Design a protein around this ligand. Structure first.
Ligand SMILES: COc1ccc(NC(=S)NCCCn2ccnc2)cc1OC
Ligand SMILES: [Zn+2]
Length: 324
């Protein structure tokens, strides 16, 4: 079955503009705010939450918090998902997502630079760097918008289990599934749309996780979103053709988005949405970074040229999907 939205290839001019990176400076300033331990229940976690909210409210986005208390192996804990929507009334959302909590590591202070400080900064960076074009797109009345979700409580408090993980994403998926709505209440839904609740408005969720290490390897995890995944492959290829990727030597190419699918199961914030038929693109590397869940998942183990390259792909992707 065809993707419900016709995916119009980015014009060369727009590819080149989106592939240009002061841009490094703004991104790094944003990232600095996330490179702090931010365990659920902590003051720094609160400060990170508030920084996300303020940053997006300053860009004139609608920002909502889904706050609740949940039982954990460490007792009751407070959680707050942050949901920012460019145009609340638009029927359909391109959803980009990540988690903003950091793992409570028993061995010491854990920064979670890839997991997921970088993805958090990347979402804010997209909103900031594309603001002018996004605000223009919002005026079109075309029924499509951008939505950013920063999930809380992705990490387990003890041993990962169905009950001890994904606290924020499980909560939000249930909340949205139970919140009934219909096309007549929303702006410009696609003709063939079946809208019965808020989750139906998530046209695709692109979940970023464990980004920032050198040479990530992505694969298509879901046949349902192959048409969308293939746009990432294509965009990356075109950025390389144009010489816009940062490589250690001339005449190398990035090959992050493999033109293949993998049979691998990864549990993450997409799971509660996947179970409710939300199409998922899971932008998570396989293998995971070497530093995964170690005290070495820190700022210095990030690979800045890779981050810049990913930012180009992501900007071009959002530009292509929203026709910015
Ligand atoms: C070390 O390499 C792996 C370890 C575990 C798994 N399997 C699962 S189900 N992981 C769930 C990860 C949830 N998460 C996301 C961010 N922080 C935690 C796969 C891995 O390599 C493909
Ligand atoms: Zn983790």
């Amino acid at each position: 079955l065809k993707w419900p939205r016709d995916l119009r290839p980015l014009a060369h001019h727009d590819l080149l503009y989106m592939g240009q990176i002061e841009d490094r400076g703004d991104f790094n300033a944003t990232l600095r705010n996330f490179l702090v331990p931010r365990v659920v229940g902590s003051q720094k976690h609160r400060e990170v939450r508030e920084f996300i909210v303020r940053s997006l409210k300053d860009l004139d986005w609608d920002v909502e918090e889904d706050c609740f208390d949940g039982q954990t192996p460490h007792g009751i804990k407070p959680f707050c998902n942050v949901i920012a929507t460019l145009n609340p009334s638009a029927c359909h959302r391109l959803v980009l997502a990540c988690h903003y909590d950091s793992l409570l590591h028993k061995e010491g202070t854990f920064i979670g630079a890839t997991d997921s400080a970088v993805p958090c900064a990347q979402l804010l960076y997209l909103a900031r760097s594309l603001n002018g074009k996004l605000q223009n797109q919002k005026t079109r009345g075309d029924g499509l918008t951008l939505q950013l979700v920063f999930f809380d409580g992705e990490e387990a408090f003890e041993r990962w289990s169905s009950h001890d993980s994904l606290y924020g994403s499980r909560h939000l998926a249930q909340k949205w599934h139970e919140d009934r709505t219909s096309a007549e209440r929303l702006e410009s839904c696609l003709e063939r749309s079946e809208i019965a609740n808020q989750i139906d408005r998530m046209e695709v969720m692109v979940l970023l996780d464990l980004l920032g290490a050198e040479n990530p390897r992505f694969y298509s995890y879901f046949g349902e979103t192959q048409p969308v995944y293939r746009r990432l492959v294509n965009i990356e290829s075109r950025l390389n053709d144009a010489g816009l990727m940062e490589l250690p030597r001339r005449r190398r190419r990035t090959n992050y988005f493999s033109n293949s699918s993998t049979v691998g199961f990864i549990e993450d914030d997409h799971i509660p949405f996947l179970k409710r038929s939300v199409p998922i693109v899971h932008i998570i590397p396989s293998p995971f970074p070497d530093v995964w869940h170690t005290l070495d998942d820190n700022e210095q183990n990030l690979h800045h040229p890779t981050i810049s390259n990913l930012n180009k792909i992501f900007k071009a992707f959002v530009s292509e999907y929203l026709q910015l």
